[PDB]
Amino acid sequence: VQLVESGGGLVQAGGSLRLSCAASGFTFSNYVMYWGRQAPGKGREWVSGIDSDGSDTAYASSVKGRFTISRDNAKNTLYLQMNNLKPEDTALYYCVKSKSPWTRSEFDDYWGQGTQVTVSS
Amino acid sequence: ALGKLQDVVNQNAQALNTLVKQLSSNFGAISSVLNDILSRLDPPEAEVQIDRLITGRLQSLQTYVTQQLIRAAEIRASANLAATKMSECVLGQSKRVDF
Amino acid sequence: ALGKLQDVVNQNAQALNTLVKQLSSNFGAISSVLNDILSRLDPPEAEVQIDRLITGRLQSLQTYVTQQLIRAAEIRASANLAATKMSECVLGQSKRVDF
Amino acid sequence: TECSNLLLQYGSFCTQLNRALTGIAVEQDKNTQEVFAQVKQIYKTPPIKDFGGFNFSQILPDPSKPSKRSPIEDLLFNKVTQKFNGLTVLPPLLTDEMIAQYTSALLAGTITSGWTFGAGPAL
Amino acid sequence: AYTNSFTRGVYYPDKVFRSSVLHSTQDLFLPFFSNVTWFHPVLPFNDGVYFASTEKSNIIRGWIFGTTLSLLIVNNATNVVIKVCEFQFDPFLCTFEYVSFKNLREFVFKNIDGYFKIYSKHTPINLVRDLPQGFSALEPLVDLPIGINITRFQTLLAYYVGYLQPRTFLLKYNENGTITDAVDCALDPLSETKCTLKSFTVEKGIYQTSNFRVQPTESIVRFPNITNLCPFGEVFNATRFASVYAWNRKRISNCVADYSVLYNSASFSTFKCYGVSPTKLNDLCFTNVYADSFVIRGDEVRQIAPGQTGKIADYNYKLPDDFTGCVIAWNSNNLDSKVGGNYNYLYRLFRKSNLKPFERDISTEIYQAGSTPCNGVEGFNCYFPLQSYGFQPTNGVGYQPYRVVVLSFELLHAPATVCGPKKSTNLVKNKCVNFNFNGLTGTGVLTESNKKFLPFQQFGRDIADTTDAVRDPQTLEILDITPCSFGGVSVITPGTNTSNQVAVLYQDVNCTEVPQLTPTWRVYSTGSNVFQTRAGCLIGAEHVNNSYECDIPIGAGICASYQTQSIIAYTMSLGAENSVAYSNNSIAIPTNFTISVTTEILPVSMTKTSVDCTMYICGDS
Amino acid sequence: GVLTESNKKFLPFQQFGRDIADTTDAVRDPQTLEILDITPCSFGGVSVI
Amino acid sequence: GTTLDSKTQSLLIVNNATNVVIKVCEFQFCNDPFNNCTFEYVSKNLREFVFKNIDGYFKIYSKHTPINLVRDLPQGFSALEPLVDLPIGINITRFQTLL
């Protein structure tokens, strides 16, 4: 299966960034993709989840009320719009394939390329 | 003495109590209650469980209907014979031996 | 006056129509068009949809055949009664009251 | 409701089954009508049971009992002896009192007019 | 203003030809006999609109649709312009630009799936101040798939506005292919009967049309009045987790358990709920919850799951194939690892056999690997039953310590001390309500009981293995569950050739439990024409005290006929009375006779059919 | 199936007809603007005497 | 318990001083009786009890009835309700009673 993520960069407080990744080797409409970040040298975390349809969205308690999650099934793209961004969010962000379809349990069998996100003033 | 009427009543009692008792089988799912499936899963897989209960209960109801339809023919033959007996023994004197 | 002859045609036509209508039900699958599932889905996934349609269609054919077998028995009983009425009312004079 | 929508995708099996059971239930009244409604009228016996020594008292209806039944029909009724999940029991079109009335009429016809009423006017 | 749209708004459902057929279409149409608005103004666009306007000098030009008053359709002297643009609209008189009382115009506007459909029809009229009486179909005119959302509209300029609602119609396609008539299937019982037998004529008789179920008036939740939150933090935000071969089992009870606290906590790298969907735990109730806590490398975390195989699954800690709960694992590299390699965490690696599920082993006897008895000899041919860990944060991430908890609970039909956050409601009885006790969702009528439960039983059960008796989780009273009253709906109809009147039979109900298009349906719901029989509630027939031959059979010795005209309900009569003048010396003899020819009709044969297996099931595939 | 001419008159907006069992019987050709009947490709049983 | 010593865990039920004590501490028992722990629910009359070992559970069914008879189990029938299911997580192969 092939995953390359797009987006990320130096972001100041209140800033926005868009992350996208395609899935090939399977149509990707059925599977659910989560957003995962690991601060360097620390544990991995679950940032947000999307339902297979797109109707149901879940977020970590940390990012509730601040982040916007959206994905497009037709060109196989998952997006993340982030608001109230801060140096607190600095981490490497992963879009993952959850290996399974039409289910809401949150964990990933696979891990994508990831993005280097640097947050500074 | 009244074996036939009681047998008909009893064959109606069972095969119907059997149908009711068949409403509580898993047929391969987690539970025999639709709500127990409904109150415990998201539709993408509560659908699979409900589908298995649907197939099981559909086979059960179809089998019951078929058995009832067959028993109906037996009762109908008996009722036609009873009407013939009424017309020929009650409304006349028969010359049929042992009828 | 001719309800007894008409209802046989009505029931048989209705049963054939229902058997045809069941060809247009997805039976809990993606769709009822075999060429479409074979067209939009790969062999491993299309096989399960085809198999579910096969089960539903086979069950519908089975229920039609069973209902025809049950109805044919009643028609045969009526044919036997009609043959008896012919042999005992037309080819002879009957003494059986109300026959 | 999810089960109902899934069921709607299995064609019209449910309609077929409901129709089949309805046909059975309607046949169960045709059977009784054919067996018992063999006579146009409802004959009544004379008040005094002077039939030349034949005492039909054990088969004729009894005015005293509230069901107007004969003793043998009483024994037949005695010797022969609910929760709902979509199940229903329809009531028979002809009540047991009406079956008793039909049987009384046939018995009165046989006793008073021979087999003459089975082919025409009671004689 | 208002008016009555007798029979309008019928449009060809699709571009498909049909002949001499009576179709059944479920789609958005305008219900017949509907109160619709009369105009000589901003108007909403709910799902569809029936626009009908009477004019002679074209005092109207077109329409404006949209939400943020958007597309313009107009008709000037000769041609018409269609386009969606950002205009300088109170109007008075780009993606696409399709610029192309005697006279009456009916228009149907629908935008479904983003496709905008217009249906139209014109007809001559010599009438005033009233909707004409008649039937006419609205052909499609042009389909424009703009793909924009619309909420309200307003015309460009008398007229009428009607709105389309989800309805099913019996349409009548003639030999020429034009809809000359239709049936509003929900208007009245007679129309529903005409729907069941797909014809506009219904012969005399009794017909079963639908099923009638009393509906839940309200919703009731009864949950325990306990308040203290379950000490989930003490399990998770604890001090340290025990070595896996001695996994601590800590029970949770008598506490309201919010699970959104675990969901919002975004430090969990694997949260997969096995026996239940995670998003429904906050409404369920649980008997008891066991939290099994221990530390395992990320590669070997996969061993902790129902129905799997592995060293930790067989020798240390086994989750059964029918496990009920959720498995939580997260990284704790910072708090569960030493610099030089921590070995405080240990596991069992040299055992004589496997373990049954939820079995802890603290055996301390030397394991044997050779064929000789160990006799306390450590070294060759005899291993120590345990194995050690190497914990340095400098390895691959698969080797880091993971505090893993299994929130195992029995979801049995039991006292269920644990529950989720759900607000109990007052208990109402004797009414069909959608109740909820401890997660036992269902609907029915709850009444007091004369039963006695054992002091540990939680609820009764019927022969069908369905709940029919419960004890209140807050007051310990036995409640009786009876399913809400229901039955079949039968229409007592004299033939349509005779009259349009109908009577309604409700099967197996009491005439009080019966309370529907009100202007038509409700008339057959009240009044002094409601009769209760042994077959159920009969509505629409008069219970006369005479008796006649059975004309339409109701049941239990009741027949209903159309007499004077109205419908009567009578206890059927078997036949005329008689008393043959029997005597010991009196005989009667015929003096004449009759030759009467009668008829008997007997079915003999039926059509011979033959259906192909492959052609019917698979066809050409 | 097999396509032949017919004489049924479609309404101008109508594109293809059906039967009492809602199965394709007629189609209105796109370019020639005619009405065509569609009939099942012949099938039968084979009996040996 | 499996071994009745400090090596393996050993459930213990006692009625003394108007109080029942249920430890899982692997106590040291002498061969004629009359450490690490897990839990302590420290709280003729024919007594009847049922014990069994389920996953992590030890079920204690019980029933008490007034009797006046000696030398055997009495006749009659009486059902044994449950009283508790102790959440004990041990493997058991043998046991012993206490007077």
Side-chain angles (χ1 to χ4, degrees), chain A residues 1 3-17 19-26 28-31 33 35-41 43-44 46-52 54 57-80 82-96 98 100-101 103-104 107 110-115 117-121, chain B, chain C residues 1-41 43-99, chain D residues 1-39 41-47 49-66 68-123, chain E residues 1-56 60-69 71-79 84-91 94 101 104-112 114-141 143-151 153-174 176-238 241-263 266-268 270-287 289-292 294-298 301-308 310-313 315-320 323-334 336 340-342 344-349 351 353-358 360-362 366-370 373-374 376 379 382-386 388-391 393 395-409 411-412 414-449 451 453-461 463-464 466-507 509-519 521-533 535-621, chain F residues 1-21 23-31 33 35-49, chain G residues 1-17 20-29 32-34 36-38 44 48-77 79-83 86-93 95-99:
Chain A
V1 151
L3 276 95
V4 162
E5 283 106 351
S6 280
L10 172 66
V11 58
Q12 283 64 14
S16 288
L17 59 82
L19 294 170
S20 183
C21 58
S24 173
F26 58 84
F28 168 78
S29 182
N30 61 37
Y31 292 136
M33 306 292 106
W35 279 113
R37 71 180 187 265
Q38 184 174 357
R44 307 194 150 178
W46 167 70
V47 180
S48 168
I50 185 72
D51 186 14
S52 317
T57 65
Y59 294 139
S61 187
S62 74
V63 291
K64 183 68 218 294
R66 291 171 60 225
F67 282 0
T68 293
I69 187 162
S70 42
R71 70 183 182 90
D72 177 43
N73 301 92
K75 187 209 311 198
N76 284 330
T77 50
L78 161 56
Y79 291 130
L80 179 58
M82 279 191 313
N83 306 318
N84 282 358
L85 263 191
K86 281 166 190 166
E88 176 186 344
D89 291 331
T90 300
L92 271 68
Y93 289 90
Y94 292 98
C95 82
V96 287
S98 187
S100 176
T103 60
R104 199 33 199 140
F107 169 70
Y110 200 70
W111 288 86
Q113 182 68 285
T115 181
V117 163
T118 196
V119 185
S120 175
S121 282
Chain B
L2 311 183
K4 307 180 201 42
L5 313 179
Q6 183 59 214
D7 172 79
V8 160
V9 169
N10 297 178
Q11 266 182 345
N12 284 155
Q14 79 184 3
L16 177 47
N17 279 343
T18 294
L19 180 76
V20 173
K21 184 262 186 176
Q22 193 75 8
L23 201 56
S24 80
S25 285
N26 301 340
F27 302 98
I30 71 175
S31 181
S32 84
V33 180
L34 294 175
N35 286 344
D36 186 0
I37 306 177
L38 291 187
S39 165
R40 275 182 50 177
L41 268 181
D42 286 299
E45 66 274 17
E47 181 277 326
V48 175
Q49 316 294 289
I50 300 306
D51 182 272
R52 289 194 250 178
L53 275 75
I54 277 173
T55 298
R57 284 171 192 190
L58 190 73
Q59 293 221 71
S60 176
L61 196 52
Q62 276 193 329
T63 287
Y64 163 75
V65 169
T66 285
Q67 312 309 70
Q68 271 297 113
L69 214 55
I70 285 177
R71 277 188 200 100
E74 293 179 353
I75 305 297
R76 194 182 30 62
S78 174
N80 281 338
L81 167 60
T84 290
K85 271 185 203 279
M86 170 79 40
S87 288
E88 310 203 9
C89 319
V90 183
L91 300 191
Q93 180 179 4
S94 191
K95 289 289 254 172
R96 312 173 58 192
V97 180
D98 297 21
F99 186 55
Chain C
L2 278 73
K4 277 214 171 173
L5 302 187
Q6 266 176 348
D7 65 357
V8 173
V9 180
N10 285 347
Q11 287 169 26
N12 294 35
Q14 171 187 26
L16 270 176
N17 273 14
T18 300
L19 175 79
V20 168
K21 300 300 316 310
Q22 296 282 130
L23 264 188
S24 75
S25 294
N26 51 79
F27 294 122
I30 297 323
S31 84
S32 62
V33 189
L34 276 186
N35 291 347
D36 285 28
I37 295 91
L38 286 171
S39 299
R40 317 196 285 97
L41 280 75
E45 56 256 45
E47 185 270 3
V48 193
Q49 299 308 296
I50 285 192
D51 192 5
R52 191 174 300 286
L53 292 175
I54 280 179
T55 61
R57 275 161 187 198
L58 189 65
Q59 186 153 259
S60 50
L61 191 42
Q62 279 273 30
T63 189
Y64 167 72
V65 168
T66 293
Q67 294 202 1
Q68 283 305 107
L69 264 186
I70 287 174
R71 284 203 220 101
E74 211 294 327
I75 291 302
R76 198 199 47 235
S78 280
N80 292 340
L81 179 56
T84 292
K85 260 176 199 265
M86 174 79 70
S87 283
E88 309 201 8
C89 316
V90 167
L91 312 196
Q93 188 197 13
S94 186
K95 283 274 194 319
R96 314 162 48 174
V97 176
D98 284 36
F99 185 54
Chain D
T1 62
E2 282 325 313
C3 191
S4 174
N5 306 347
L6 277 167
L7 181 56
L8 297 203
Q9 289 187 357
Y10 285 79
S12 51
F13 286 126
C14 281
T15 306
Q16 281 176 248
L17 309 184
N18 306 319
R19 189 184 305 142
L21 296 187
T22 304
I24 288 178
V26 73
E27 200 85 351
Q28 310 306 308
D29 285 309
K30 165 141 72 195
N31 281 350
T32 303
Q33 173 92 17
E34 286 190 346
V35 172
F36 280 95
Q38 292 278 317
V39 64
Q41 288 176 19
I42 296 289
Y43 313 95
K44 301 193 84 56
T45 44
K49 311 287 178 289
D50 179 75
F51 299 116
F54 294 68
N55 202 2
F56 295 98
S57 289
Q58 310 283 124
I59 61 188
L60 274 174
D62 204 324
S64 73
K65 290 139 182 40
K68 280 74 66 182
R69 291 204 282 260
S70 44
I72 310 181
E73 289 181 353
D74 283 349
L75 304 196
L76 284 164
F77 278 165
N78 297 349
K79 188 70 185 298
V80 168
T81 297
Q82 286 165 20
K83 53 184 51 58
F84 294 97
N85 296 115
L87 281 73
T88 44
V89 167
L90 288 78
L93 172 66
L94 271 171
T95 67
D96 291 331
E97 171 66 31
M98 282 179 186
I99 311 292
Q101 271 197 71
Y102 274 138
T103 291
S104 78
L106 289 145
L107 192 64
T110 284
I111 293 156
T112 64
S113 70
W115 63 81
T116 62
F117 71 103
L123 291 154
Chain E
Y2 282 62
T3 187
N4 183 20
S5 74
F6 280 67
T7 58
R8 302 293 181 187
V10 297
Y11 55 98
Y12 291 83
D14 192 87
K15 296 167 152 278
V16 169
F17 183 64
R18 300 191 179 95
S19 196
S20 307
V21 71
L22 282 85
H23 203 42
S24 171
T25 53
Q26 204 291 328
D27 199 336
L28 276 297
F29 292 86
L30 166 75
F32 292 167
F33 291 95
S34 55
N35 259 334
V36 289
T37 308
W38 177 350
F39 275 71
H40 289 288
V42 170
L43 290 166
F45 179 77
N46 299 292
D47 51 355
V49 166
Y50 171 54
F51 184 100
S53 47
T54 59
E55 49 177 341
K56 40 215 167 180
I60 317 167
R61 299 275 93 86
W63 291 268
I64 290 297
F65 313 101
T67 299
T68 54
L69 273 77
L71 193 145
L72 68 93
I73 53 172
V74 74
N75 164 46
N76 62 9
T78 50
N79 52 5
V84 52
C85 291
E86 314 154 10
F87 178 70
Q88 311 146 321
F89 33 80
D90 187 354
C94 290
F101 289 162
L104 187 153
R105 283 85 169 94
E106 308 186 5
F107 267 60
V108 159
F109 297 112
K110 294 166 61 135
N111 190 75
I112 306 297
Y115 285 62
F116 193 88
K117 315 171 178 333
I118 61 170
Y119 305 85
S120 86
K121 175 80 166 188
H122 303 324
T123 187
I125 49 175
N126 198 354
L127 283 76
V128 285
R129 301 292 296 164
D130 186 65
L131 266 173
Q133 291 318 317
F135 193 80
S136 178
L138 270 68
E139 297 80 2
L141 201 63
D143 179 15
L144 303 181
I146 309 102
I148 53 161
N149 301 339
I150 293 177
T151 289
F153 64 92
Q154 163 151 9
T155 179
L156 298 181
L157 77 165
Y159 63 90
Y160 307 133
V161 173
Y163 301 99
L164 310 193
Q165 304 150 42
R167 300 285 267 210
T168 318
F169 280 177
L170 180 63
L171 305 174
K172 179 157 172 288
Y173 293 75
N174 69 343
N176 308 351
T178 56
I179 301 174
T180 62
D181 211 340
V183 172
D184 195 351
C185 202
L187 175 53
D188 49 341
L190 184 48
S191 301
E192 211 167 358
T193 286
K194 296 175 184 183
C195 289
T196 60
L197 278 75
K198 302 178 32 178
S199 174
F200 283 59
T201 53
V202 173
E203 65 264 56
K204 186 175 179 65
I206 185 168
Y207 304 77
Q208 199 273 334
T209 66
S210 57
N211 283 278
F212 153 67
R213 184 167 306 116
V214 181
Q215 293 287 355
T217 77
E218 64 183 1
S219 175
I220 290 190
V221 177
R222 299 281 292 185
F223 265 33
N225 51 16
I226 64 185
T227 62
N228 56 92
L229 184 71
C230 291
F232 269 137
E234 298 175 6
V235 190
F236 288 82
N237 287 339
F241 281 36
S243 304
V244 57
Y245 74 74
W247 45 272
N248 184 55
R249 171 166 100 181
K250 169 161 178 33
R251 198 183 64 189
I252 315 174
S253 62
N254 296 58
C255 50
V256 165
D258 198 342
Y259 290 66
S260 58
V261 297
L262 296 180
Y263 303 165
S267 52
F268 301 129
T270 308
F271 189 83
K272 199 178 85 55
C273 280
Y274 270 83
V276 66
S277 169
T279 74
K280 317 200 66 78
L281 288 159
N282 286 312
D283 311 336
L284 289 169
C285 283
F286 283 149
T287 65
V289 181
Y290 292 165
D292 302 325
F294 56 91
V295 164
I296 294 289
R297 310 179 312 96
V301 161
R302 282 42 188 170
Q303 286 216 30
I304 299 304
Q308 296 188 179
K311 187 45 66 186
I312 310 305
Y315 275 23
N316 197 318
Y317 171 79
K318 182 55 189 159
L319 283 182
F323 162 75
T324 47
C326 297
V327 167
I328 315 183
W330 62 87
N331 200 234
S332 58
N333 208 17
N334 298 325
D336 281 312
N342 183 294
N344 298 123
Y345 307 119
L346 276 296
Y347 49 105
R348 195 166 301 277
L349 187 55
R351 200 181 192 273
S353 70
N354 282 14
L355 288 177
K356 52 169 170 311
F358 282 71
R360 219 166 152 173
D361 175 65
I362 55 163
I366 297 301
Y367 173 69
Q368 178 179 4
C374 287
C382 276
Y383 287 67
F384 183 72
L386 310 179
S388 77
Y389 263 119
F391 277 123
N395 301 322
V397 292
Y399 290 86
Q400 295 167 5
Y402 282 109
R403 271 176 174 177
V404 61
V405 192
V406 164
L407 287 204
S408 57
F409 41 69
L411 190 150
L412 317 169
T417 66
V418 188
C419 279
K422 184 66 75 61
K423 329 300 298 162
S424 189
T425 76
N426 183 10
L427 189 66
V428 189
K429 294 186 177 187
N430 317 295
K431 291 180 182 179
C432 172
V433 298
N434 188 330
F435 59 77
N436 179 351
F437 291 180
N438 306 151
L440 279 163
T441 54
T443 187
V445 171
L446 316 169
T447 73
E448 300 180 33
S449 177
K451 273 176 172 173
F453 277 35
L454 278 191
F456 77 106
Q457 273 153 343
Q458 295 310 286
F459 56 108
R461 194 146 278 187
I463 296 89
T466 183
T467 318
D468 67 334
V470 290
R471 144 165 287 157
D472 193 11
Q474 293 201 5
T475 64
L476 320 185
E477 47 177 307
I478 307 297
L479 304 181
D480 291 352
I481 290 187
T482 63
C484 300
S485 181
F486 63 90
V489 164
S490 307
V491 171
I492 312 304
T493 186
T496 52
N497 186 30
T498 309
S499 174
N500 263 326
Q501 196 168 349
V502 294
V504 181
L505 178 69
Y506 289 95
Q507 313 205 25
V509 298
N510 192 330
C511 276
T512 71
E513 281 73 0
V514 61
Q516 290 180 358
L517 268 287
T518 300
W521 270 98
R522 202 258 316 157
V523 178
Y524 314 121
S525 302
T526 56
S528 80
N529 62 327
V530 179
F531 189 43
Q532 170 77 52
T533 68
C537 193
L538 188 67
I539 280 178
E542 178 211 344
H543 177 217
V544 288
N545 280 321
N546 303 321
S547 44
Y548 318 86
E549 316 292 2
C550 197
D551 200 1
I552 302 171
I554 301 317
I558 287 287
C559 311
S561 167
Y562 186 54
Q563 279 200 6
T564 301
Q565 295 268 32
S566 57
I567 292 188
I568 43 174
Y570 48 96
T571 298
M572 65 180 288
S573 63
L574 307 183
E577 57 284 338
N578 200 335
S579 308
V580 190
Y582 173 91
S583 168
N584 66 348
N585 65 347
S586 170
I587 193 183
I589 287 192
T591 54
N592 195 346
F593 57 88
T594 292
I595 309 299
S596 67
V597 180
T598 59
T599 299
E600 260 165 0
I601 312 181
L602 294 162
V604 158
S605 62
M606 50 176 209
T607 302
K608 309 166 51 175
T609 77
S610 179
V611 176
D612 183 13
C613 176
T614 293
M615 185 180 290
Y616 176 84
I617 290 173
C618 289
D620 46 12
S621 161
Chain F
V2 169
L3 320 174
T4 73
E5 190 187 7
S6 77
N7 47 5
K8 317 167 183 315
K9 287 191 288 185
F10 274 18
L11 297 189
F13 62 88
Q14 283 168 344
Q15 294 308 96
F16 61 99
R18 269 184 190 153
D19 289 329
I20 313 301
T23 177
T24 300
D25 63 351
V27 75
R28 155 196 287 283
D29 45 7
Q31 309 169 5
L33 301 203
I35 304 302
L36 289 178
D37 280 345
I38 301 177
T39 44
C41 185
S42 183
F43 62 91
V46 159
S47 293
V48 183
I49 295 91
Chain G
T2 303
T3 72
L4 278 300
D5 58 349
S6 49
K7 280 171 52 56
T8 51
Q9 283 261 286
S10 301
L11 196 151
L12 165 63
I13 301 162
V14 175
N15 173 11
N16 51 11
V20 310
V21 163
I22 297 89
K23 328 177 54 179
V24 192
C25 313
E26 40 185 4
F27 191 79
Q28 268 299 100
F29 306 109
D32 190 6
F34 64 102
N36 300 322
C37 295
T38 298
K44 311 185 72 168
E48 291 178 353
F49 292 76
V50 174
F51 311 133
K52 63 179 72 176
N53 214 56
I54 323 297
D55 271 2
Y57 290 166
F58 172 94
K59 303 206 167 39
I60 298 193
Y61 297 111
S62 71
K63 161 80 165 186
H64 165 244
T65 174
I67 305 295
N68 192 356
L69 200 46
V70 190
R71 221 158 288 142
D72 54 351
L73 285 165
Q75 287 302 292
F77 195 82
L80 269 67
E81 310 164 349
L83 188 150
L86 277 297
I88 320 303
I90 192 65
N91 168 23
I92 304 195
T93 72
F95 72 98
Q96 177 173 3
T97 180
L98 307 177
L99 298 90

